[PDB]
């Protein structure tokens, strides 16, 4: 169930990057976007290899270049290919090598105040980094699409017994009821907030659409990195800021770290109506995405196991749902 194989990746790497890899293992996942990851090692340097297919090939590297250019070291820059490129397109898939980084992500590695400040500084460097007109005309933009809200509302009349349902699809069906009220409150609120917000395409900055503890690699002491730049966007800073104290992953939910963060980001003016909105909409979408996954055709077997898992966590103590409803500064 793995694309390339042993000596095959090695041959690929050596052909397009002129690197001599002796070992090249396959990793079970990482950040799935039709992208498999491998840890290829050279006589002295380890590399993180990524192969993209379907919802993979795009143009986000237009940002990491813009960001590297802007001078943000807290980003993992791609290894150039012999044709002097940052990737290697191959009829079937795309190759994107990175220097390998061993560093627990934020879900198993907390940040030191210092690091919390450093993150705040970077998120700011980024939020400030000017975006070329030609780049803006690409980046998706905050529209407040009810896409997600609507998909969730669909489920409502779809929760009931149907022998055509197995164990898993069942627990979910039930967990959904058991929390029926809370969920409607997320849709009806995300919607309500949606109306109270007067858009302003001028206060929109470059944002890492989904910057949670899962995408901060916490290294030695300054070696923090903000990974996953597949779907960056242009939105009010609150699109990113909502994660600080947001509780995603059941971490990043300790009020005192928020202070540390704004220290580096430099305390400014945050729209709490917008901040609150994102915390709600995000959960909606998650419910939407996970929902579909657990309703329809059990064809997505071995996946739906996790969807359900994450789905439930959202409701655990001091997790994203608790925090959203506890609308605090
Ligand atoms: N996360 C612990 C250490 N390495 S890793 O496989 O998870 C990993 C995940 C995601 C990205 Cl983008 C990477 C980039 C470079 N090295 C390791 C990377
Ligand atoms: Ni550099």
Numbering used by the authors: 3 to 331
Task: Show sentences the authors wrote.
For aminoglycosides, a group of antibiotics used to treat serious nosocomial infections, the main mechanism of resistance is via the enzymatic inactivation of the drug by acetyltransferases, nucleotidyltransferases, or phosphotransferases. Among the three types of aminoglycoside-modifying enzymes, aminoglycoside phosphotransferases or kinases (APHs) yield the highest levels of resistance thereby providing a rationale for focusing inhibitor development for these specific resistance factors. Combined, these studies reveal that although members of the APH family share low similarities in sequence and their ligand specificity varies greatly, their overall three-dimensional fold is homologous to each other and to that of ePKs. To further examine the suitability of the CKI-7 scaffold for inhibitor development, we determined the crystal structures of APH(3′)-IIIa and APH(9)-Ia in complex with CKI-7.
APH(9)-Ia is an atypical APH which phosphorylates only one aminoglycoside, spectinomycin, that is distinct from the other aminoglycoside antibiotics. This structure has been refined to 2.9 Å and a final Rcryst and Rfree of 0.222 and 0.279, respectively. For APH(9)-Ia, this same loop (residues 28–34) also adopts a different conformation in the APH(9)-Ia-CKI-7 structure compared to the nucleotide-bound state. In APH(9)-Ia, the aminoethyl group of the inhibitor is positioned in the entrance pocket or the solvent-exposed side of the adenine-binding pocket and it points back at itself forming an intramolecular interaction with the equatorial sulfonyl oxygen atom (O2S). The inhibitor also makes a second interaction with the linker region of APH(9)-Ia via the Nβ of the aminoethyl tail and the main chain carbonyl of Ile103. As a result, the orientation and conformation of CKI-7 observed in APH(9)-Ia mirrors what is seen in CK1.
